[PDB]
Amino acid sequence: ADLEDNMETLNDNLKVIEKADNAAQVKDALTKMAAAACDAWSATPPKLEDKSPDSPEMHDFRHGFWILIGQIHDALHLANEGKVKEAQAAAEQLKCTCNACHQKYR
Amino acid sequence: ADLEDNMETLNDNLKVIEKADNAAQVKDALTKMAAAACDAWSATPPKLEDKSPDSPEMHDFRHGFWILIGQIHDALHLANEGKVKEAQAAAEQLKCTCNACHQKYR
Amino acid sequence: ADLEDNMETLNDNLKVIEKADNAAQVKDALTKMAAAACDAWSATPPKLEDKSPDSPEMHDFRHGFWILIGQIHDALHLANEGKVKEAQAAAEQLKCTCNACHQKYR
Amino acid sequence: ADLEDNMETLNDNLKVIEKADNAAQVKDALTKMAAAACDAWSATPPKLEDKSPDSPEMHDFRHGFWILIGQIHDALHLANEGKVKEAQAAAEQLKCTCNACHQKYR
Numbered sequence: 521a522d523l524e525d526n527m528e529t530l531n532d533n534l535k536v537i538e539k540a541d542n543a544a545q546v547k548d549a550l551t552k553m554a555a556a557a558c559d560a561w562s563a564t565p566p567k568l569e570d571k572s573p574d575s576p577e578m579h580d581f582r583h584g585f586w587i588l589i590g591q592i593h594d595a596l597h598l599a600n601e602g603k604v605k606e607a608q609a610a611a612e613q614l615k616c617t618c619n620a621c622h623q624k625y626r
Numbered sequence: 627a628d629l630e631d632n633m634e635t636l637n638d639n640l641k642v643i644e645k646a647d648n649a650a651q652v653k654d655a656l657t658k659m660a661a662a663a664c665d666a667w668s669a670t671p672p673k674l675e676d677k678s679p680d681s682p683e684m685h686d687f688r689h690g691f692w693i694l695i696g697q698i699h700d701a702l703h704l705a706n707e708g709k710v711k712e713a714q715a716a717a718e719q720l721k722c723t724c725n726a727c728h729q730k731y732r
Numbered sequence: 733a734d735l736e737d738n739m740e741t742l743n744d745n746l747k748v749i750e751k752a753d754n755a756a757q758v759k760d761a762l763t764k765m766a767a768a769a770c771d772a773w774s775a776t777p778p779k780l781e782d783k784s785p786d787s788p789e790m791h792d793f794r795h796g797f798w799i800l801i802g803q804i805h806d807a808l809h810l811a812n813e814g815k816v817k818e819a820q821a822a823a824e825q826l827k828c829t830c831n832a833c834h835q836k837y838r
Numbered sequence: 839a840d841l842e843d844n845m846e847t848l849n850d851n852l853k854v855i856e857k858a859d860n861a862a863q864v865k866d867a868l869t870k871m872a873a874a875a876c877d878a879w880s881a882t883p884p885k886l887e888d889k890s891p892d893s894p895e896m897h898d899f900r901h902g903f904w905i906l907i908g909q910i911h912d913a914l915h916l917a918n919e920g921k922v923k924e925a926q927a928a929a930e931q932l933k934c935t936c937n938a939c940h941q942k943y944r
């Protein structure tokens with residue numbers, strides 16, 4: 521979609537995970553989160569509406585999204601294990617990845 | 627795309643890599659594969675069309691893609707490292723994931 | 733302990749997963765493979781005795797163990813979920829990393 | 839190495855990264871973080887002396903080191919690629935994993 525939906529989607533589901541009662545929601549929340557980051561891998565962002573698809577600023581923008589998927593893929597294992605709290609921890613801990621990309625690219 | 631389209635995409639570029647002279651042909655191919663990977667797991671493979679989206683078979687089907695997506699990423703760092711060769715052997719190596727998913731869920 | 737020593741615990745603990753009946757044994761093998769891969773990452777292989785600790789191939793050699801390690805890490809998460817079948821097929825996929833390394837430096 | 843040593847190595851090798859001129863410094867600083875993180879996996883901590891080797895606290899304590907390696911594993915390719923700025927950024931991102939373990943386990 522629009523990058524902003526994806527981002528809102530990511531963000532919404534973060535709060536959802538912050539607030540979530542159990543594994544059930546965390547699981548779908550992360551399922552939701554992962555499709556969107558994946559959907560965002562391909563977009564050419566406002567700040568980099570300039571340079572071409574293969575350059576050290578459109579590669580490193582894109583690499584930030586694999587950091588993100590792996591960390592979603594970890595929490596989802598934790599969310600699967602019946603370990604809500606330690607999976608909600610992992611969800612909090614991707615805010616650091618959210619911010620790093622943001623700092624160079626937003 | 628639907629599942630089949632992504633799967634040709636995955637196979638066409640796995641071919642590209644095998645013949646690629648240089649790192650740039652590898653990077654672009656592996657870039658196409660990643661999106662094809664993350665598009666593909668939103669699909670319901672015929673073999674499991676019956677089963678519910680939330681189901682052991684179907685959560686494992688989706689998990690296979692993270693494994694492919696992690697691999698392409700690493701393979702893509704080796705493509706950004708100028709190391710033309712080891713990226714191909716890394717890509718070849720991921721045929722194992724392809725085969726494993728196909729051995730169970732095709 | 734040393735390389736030839738470490739590889740047997742890998743080779744042996746690989747064998748214990750292939751036949752296992754419950755999680756604990758698999759969880760149990762997987763963590764020694766990691767220690768065995770913790771222990772083995774530091775060492776120097778007979779094919780690279782001449783090479784400096786900052787050589788390309790020694791870096792490419794330590795790399796193999798991370799891939800192997802990264803797979804063990806995920807393979808442990810499925811065991812933790814009790815998914816015995818999946819954890820046996822995941823451990824099976826490790827041979828691809830085992831074999832990738834041996835072509836080059838064993 | 840022991841836990842206190844391994845931590846010292848992590849903390850100093852990071853600070854080396856923060857202050858780095860080049861890429862081969864960061865390459866070498868991260869490698870010693872990886873050696874130390876590998877090595878701390880087998881240590882049992884002052885908060886969990888009372889806890890058993892295969893237990894929820896110790897399995898999840900060893901998992902903290904599995905995360906960190908991956909971020910360390912990933913930090914090297916940026917560095918390897920002469921990508922100093924963004925390798926340092928991946929080193930600042932380790933602090934979220936650093937902190938995560940301490941809150942739960944120090």
Ligand code: HEC
Nearest residue numbers: 524527530531565566581584585588617618621622625626
């Ligand atoms: C780069 C690789 C990013 C990662 C990883 C994440 N975000 Fe993002 N985000 C990114 C950009 C370039 C932008 C700007 C889009 C724009 O409006 O021009 C954003 C934006 C947001 C927003 C605000 C959207 C808006 O309407 O302005 C939010 C709320 C947001 N991002 C949240 C968010 C969260 C929670 C993330 C991790 C879970 C995350 N982002 C990752 C780039 C990147």
Ligand code: HEC
Nearest residue numbers: 630633636637640671672687690691694723724727731732
């Ligand atoms: C599951 C997690 C899969 C992974 C990983 C890969 N593939 Fe796949 N592939 C998968 C399914 C379920 C199917 C069947 C599609 C159908 O409905 O018929 C396929 C199919 C293919 C095909 C042929 C498509 C067809 O006509 O049926 C090809 C050429 C193919 N897959 C290639 C391929 C490659 C190269 C992969 C890794 C790089 C790969 N697949 C991974 C499921 C999964």
Ligand code: HEC
Nearest residue numbers: 735736739742743777778793796797800829830833837838
């Ligand atoms: C490099 C990154 C490696 C990975 C990953 C694995 N192995 Fe290995 N192995 C490696 C080297 C360099 C050597 C030779 C070193 C020496 O001096 O012995 C080996 C050797 C073995 C052997 C031979 C032991 C013997 O009978 O003499 C075995 C059986 C072996 N390796 C098994 C093995 C398995 C099962 C792995 C994955 C699970 C694996 N190795 C990974 C280098 C690397």
Ligand code: HEC
Nearest residue numbers: 841842845848849883899902903906932935936939943944
């Ligand atoms: C668990 C998975 C950990 C990770 C990841 C990191 N650290 Fe750690 N650290 C951990 C424990 C259990 C302890 C206390 C152990 C003890 O016996 O003291 C520590 C301690 C430290 C210290 C303090 C040294 C002291 O005065 O006792 C420092 C400075 C430290 N840790 C730094 C550090 C850094 C920089 C890390 C990431 C880059 C990091 N730690 C990760 C457990 C874990």
Ligand SMILES: [Ca+2]
Nearest residue numbers: 630631633634
């Ligand atoms: Ca077809």
Ligand SMILES: [Ca+2]
Nearest residue numbers: 627628631632
């Ligand atoms: Ca098409």
Ligand SMILES: [Ca+2]
Nearest residue numbers: 840841842843
């Ligand atoms: Ca000491």
Ligand SMILES: [Zn+2]
Nearest residue numbers: 594809901904
């Ligand atoms: Zn994990």
Ligand SMILES: [Zn+2]
Nearest residue numbers: 627628630631
């Ligand atoms: Zn089509």
Ligand SMILES: [Zn+2]
Nearest residue numbers: 627628630631
């Ligand atoms: Zn079609």
Ligand SMILES: [Zn+2]
Nearest residue numbers: 627628630631
């Ligand atoms: Zn069509």
Ligand SMILES: [Zn+2]
Nearest residue numbers: 634635637638
């Ligand atoms: Zn085609």
Ligand SMILES: [Zn+2]
Nearest residue numbers: 700703795911
């Ligand atoms: Zn790598």
Ligand SMILES: [Zn+2]
Nearest residue numbers: 734735736737
């Ligand atoms: Zn011996």
Ligand SMILES: [Zn+2]
Nearest residue numbers: 593597806809
């Ligand atoms: Zn996994």
Ligand SMILES: [Zn+2]
Nearest residue numbers: 839840877878
């Ligand atoms: Zn030690």
